[PDB]
Design a protein around this ligand. Structure first.
Ligand SMILES: [Zn+2]
Ligand SMILES: [Zn+2]
Ligand SMILES: [Zn+2]
Ligand SMILES: [Zn+2]
Length: 184
């Protein structure tokens, strides 16, 4: 259900894979388990806090994260086919970063907490409630699963604050691949 090469590599905006639409995971096997671990690896390697499969080249509904960002020094949470059952009616701001946008940080407003439904790697379902940082990392990654990027939820003003930044990635993309980016 998922073919990947190890060391995983981070996919950077404006690569199309980040918008490509993700298929649900319906095969809970060894491969799926090896993937999750490989995801935590590249996440920690790149000193990240969360990572979704689209970010490693796979268009499936898989996500991982650890508030700490350090191996064996936090809380590792992986989610398969996550569904947001409920989210807070109170909004809070936070400067978000993303591995697909090297060194770029801007303010994003999101509900402070959520209630999720998901499956684990064995395919067993589970439900949990997130708030604080875990809730914030979760929503950012859930969006990735919807082909939604964090600048999509920024205000017009905060967006202007990083327009040149995103523009530089579009050019870098063109220069590296030799292909025109689905920019703007
Ligand atoms: Zn399948
Ligand atoms: Zn590993
Ligand atoms: Zn991200
Ligand atoms: Zn410009």
């Amino acid at each position: 259900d998922v073919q990947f090469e190890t060391p995983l590599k981070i996919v950077e905006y404006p690569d199309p894979i980040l918008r490509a639409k993700n298929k649900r995971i319906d095969i809970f096997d060894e491969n799926l388990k090896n993937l999750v671990d490989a995801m935590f690896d590249v996440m920690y390697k790149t000193d990240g806090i969360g990572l979704s499969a689209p970010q490693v080249g796979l268009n499936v509904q898989l996500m991982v994260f650890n508030p700490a960002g350090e191996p064996g020094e936090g809380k590792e949470i992986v989610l398969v086919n996550p569904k947001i059952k409920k989210y807070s009616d109170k909004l809070v701001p936070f400067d978000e970063g993303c591995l697909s946008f090297p060194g770029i940080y801007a303010e994003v407003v999101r509900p402070q907490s959520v209630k999720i439904d998901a499956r684990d790697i064995t395919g067993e379902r589970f439900s949990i409630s997130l708030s604080r940082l875990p809730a914030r990392i979760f929503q950012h990654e859930y969006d990735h699963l919807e082909g939604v990027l964090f600048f999509d939820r920024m205000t017009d003003q905060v967006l202007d604050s990083i327009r040149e930044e995103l523009e530089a990635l579009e050019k870098k993309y063109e220069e590296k691949t030799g292909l025109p980016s689905p920019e703007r």
